Paper text:
Among the most extensively studied orphan receptors are the chicken ovalbumin upstream promoter-transcription factors (COUP-TFs), which belong to the NR2F subfamily. Here we demonstrate that COUP-TFII is a ligand-regulated nuclear receptor that can be activated by unphysiological micromolar concentrations of retinoic acids.
Here we report the 1.48 Å crystal structure of the LBD of human COUP-TFII. The human COUP-TFII LBD was purified to homogeneity in a ligand-free state. There is one LBD molecule per asymmetric unit, but COUP-TFII forms a symmetric dimer through crystal packing. The structure contains 10 α helices that are folded into a typical three-layered helical sandwich seen in other NRs. The dimer interface is made up of residues involved in hydrophobic interactions and hydrogen bonding, with the majority of the hydrophobic interactions observed between residues found on the N-terminal half of helix α10 of each monomer, which forms a parallel coiled-coil structure in the crystal. Due to the bulky size of these aromatic side chains and the dense pack of the binding pocket in COUP-TFII, there is no room for any ligand to bind in this conformation. The kink in helix α10 and the subsequent collapse of the binding pocket of COUP-TFII allows the AF2 helix, which follows α10, to bind in the cofactor binding site of the LBD. The N-terminal end of AF2 is stabilized by a hydrogen bond between Q393 (AF2) and R246 (α4), and the C-terminal end of the AF2 is stabilized by hydrogen bonding between the conserved charge clamp residue R228 (α3) and two backbone carbonyl groups from residues M399 and L400 (AF2). In this orientation of the AF2 helix, neither coactivators nor corepressors are able to bind to COUP-TFII, and therefore this structure represents an autorepressed form of this orphan NR.
Numbering used by the authors: 171 to 193, 207 to 268, 286 to 407
Write the structure that this text describes.
Amino acid sequence: GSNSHSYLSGYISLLLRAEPYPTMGIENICELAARMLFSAVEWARNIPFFPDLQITDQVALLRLTWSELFVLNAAQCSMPLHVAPVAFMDHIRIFQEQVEKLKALHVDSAEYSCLKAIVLFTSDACGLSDVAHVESLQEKSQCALEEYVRSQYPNQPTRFGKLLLRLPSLRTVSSSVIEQLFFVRLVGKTPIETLIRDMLLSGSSFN
């Protein structure tokens, strides 16, 4: 913005404000997973810029990234992870490290919200209509993150690069494993990527 430094800060505050949570019958692990997914989509509907993208671009971005946002939200919310002391466990084991590494870096709420924006605004999605604009938005998100981290963590000079190096691992987590682990009772069967568009068009608040 036109005081760049303060407007990058205002951005992060808006990314934060978009989060539904802080972010009787006690959620079970699969209800917890559905909330982590729905909250990703609701957060995306309420951040700056995303909702103004053409709808088909919004769908393309979420279809690719939902699993990475899912992982970010699962780490953020400390979703219980070894859990069924029933499960596989190659599946259980590979979701797990990524969560554990983000918690190990003590990623803060701000950093989570930036990382989710950087993940969402990816020009890797198939079928985008305005790739330059999405890139610009990712550049803004990364430039916001960099500024935050240099100012909040001035004695951890490598922190920015460590946070960015979480990204490739997100991109390798398998969508099918996440589905198999958490979403089968809810969905079968059906790949989440095929239901994302309905999800985005559902989903409540005026805010």
